[PDB]
Design a protein around this ligand. Structure first.
Ligand SMILES: [Ca+2]
Length: 355
């Protein structure tokens, strides 16, 4: 902190003076910075010179250029990239740096600051609306899928506050386009995408994901805003799918069904994924709980999973009677079949947003 990034003729110690940390992750670090040229606060994302995260940073730049061209003022609530540069470190490491408008706390930071208590519904509604506007812009105006919708990637960059500090009138930015994919030509993909807790079932099952996987993540995000708590807390595919089945078991038509079995000759990424997913099934049904151990009749692992699934609520029981409208909205999102999920422009017409 206190160094500069992006040396220039006028500012050889760096145009962007590092002020404070903002966030970090496997991608690298985000720092609050003073732009010595325009004399503004900005946020700069510096990607670790690791190649994996650096080539992701370059596709992010490309998408953000197109989003910013179509929406300079972020009326559709995607983060605005102001600039980008390569910071050749004094060692020799070149870091890809993205310069963003001044940012703000994430939804995760908000939940954490409130001790993972429920977000009040009027704020939930305002955040949900702006995030759907962002997702509509991506899917329908740009044919881009984000794939990484989660609390850490939804920022409140501007916000009035009511006094501890409450949040009123949030101004949302969706961030992190380093995993976004253009789907205007290629309709379906099969790579594993999304962080575990927000990952749609079709990604696990190998049946092909598209725009709809973002609506699943969105639905899981909203439930977490309502309860304060991550909805799917498993890191194992078999148990994760069962938690989905349990949540939705009282929703008509909501069953986890296996992918079609691939030709044994088929070498594609999608076939490989479907073969793996089929190991989660026995005679066409999800092989839970028996598939958790299957090496011991009496199993500690199997017993833990049974308790975790028993603790998982049915979707309808999460919501207070007076919040039936939000439940109806989430039902249009948390559908196991991606073809049943609503488009974000349709979700924006839902009565939850008129009232
Ligand atoms: Ca990410």
């Amino acid at each position: 902190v206190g160094e500069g990034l992006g040396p220039t003729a006028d500012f050889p110690n760096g145009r962007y003076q590092i002020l404070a940390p903002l966030g970090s992750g496997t991608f690298g670090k985000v720092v609050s910075c003073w732009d010595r040229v325009t004399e503004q606060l900005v946020a700069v994302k510096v990607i670790r010179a690791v190649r994996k995260y650096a080539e992701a940073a370059r596709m992010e730049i490309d998408i953000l250029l197109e989003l910013g061209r179509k929406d300079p003022t972020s009326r559709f609530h995607c983060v605005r990239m102001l600039s980008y540069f390569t910071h050749v470190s004094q060692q020799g490491n070149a870091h890809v740096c993205l310069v963003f408008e001044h940012l703000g706390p994430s939804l995760f930071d908000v939940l954490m600051r409130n001790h993972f208590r429920p977000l009040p519904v009027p704020i939930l509604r305002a955040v949900a609306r702006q995030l759907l506007e962002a997702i509509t812009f991506l899917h329908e105006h740009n044919q881009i899928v984000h794939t990484d919708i989660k609390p850490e990637n939804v920022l409140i960059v501007k916000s009035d506050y009511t006094e501890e500090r409450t949040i009123v009138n949030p101004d949302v930015r969706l961030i992190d386009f380093g995993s976004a994919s253009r789907l205007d030509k290629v309709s379906v993909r099969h790579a594993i995408v999304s962080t575990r807790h927000y990952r749609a079932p079709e990604i696990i099952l190998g049946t092909g994901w598209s725009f709809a996987c973002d609506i699943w993540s969105f639905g899981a995000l909203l439930v977490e805003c309502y309860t304060g708590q991550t909805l799917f807390q498993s890191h194992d595919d078999l148990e994760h799918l069962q938690l989905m089945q349990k949540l939705l078991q009282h929703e008509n038509g909501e069953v986890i069904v296996p992918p079609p079995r691939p030709s044994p000759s088929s070498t594609s990424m999608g076939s490989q994924r479907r073969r793996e997913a089929l190991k989660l099934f026995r005679d066409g049904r999800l092989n839970w709980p028996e598939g958790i151990d299957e090496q011991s009749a009496n199993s500690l692992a199997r017993q833990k999973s049974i308790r975790r699934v028993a603790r998982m609520p049915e979707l309808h029981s999460i919501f207070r009677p007076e919040h039936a409208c939000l439940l109806h909205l989430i039902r249009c999102c948390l559908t196991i079949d991606p073809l049943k999920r609503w488009r974000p422009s349709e979700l924006l017409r839902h009565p939850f947003f008129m009232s």
